[PDB]
């Protein structure tokens, strides 16, 4: 997530112009307790994920 956030950031700025990062069938080796971290973090970086 950090990488794909960086790569989309236009030069100088740190708020990417394109926003819609997808995901699919992601959490098949983790507990509901830890997965709650990723969901909050992803939105924190500034992205917006289906």
């Amino acid at each position: 997530t950090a990488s794909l956030s960086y790569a989309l950031c236009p030069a100088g700025s740190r708020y990417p112009l394109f926003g819609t990062i997808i995901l699919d069938e992601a959490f098949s080796r983790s507990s509901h307790a830890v997965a709650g971290r990723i969901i909050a973090a992803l939105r924190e970086f500034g992205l917006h994920a289906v």
Binding site: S30, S31, A33, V34
Partner: protein, 50 residues
């Protein structure tokens, strides 16, 4: 379907009990029972459950 398992233990040797002593994150002696007919081992991430 649960109670038919009783055949195992006559045609086969089934699992009954597992114990540890100073293994991994289990200090000292430790124990665990198991039933004749299917069980589960559940717990949150990072708990030695594998």
């Amino acid at each position: 379907m649960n109670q038919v398992s009783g055949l195992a233990g006559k045609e086969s040797f089934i699992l009954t009990r597992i114990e540890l002593f100073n293994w991994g994150g289990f200090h000292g002696l430790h124990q665990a029972a198991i039933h004749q007919d299917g069980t589960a081992v559940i717990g949150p991430t990072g708990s030695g459950k594998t």
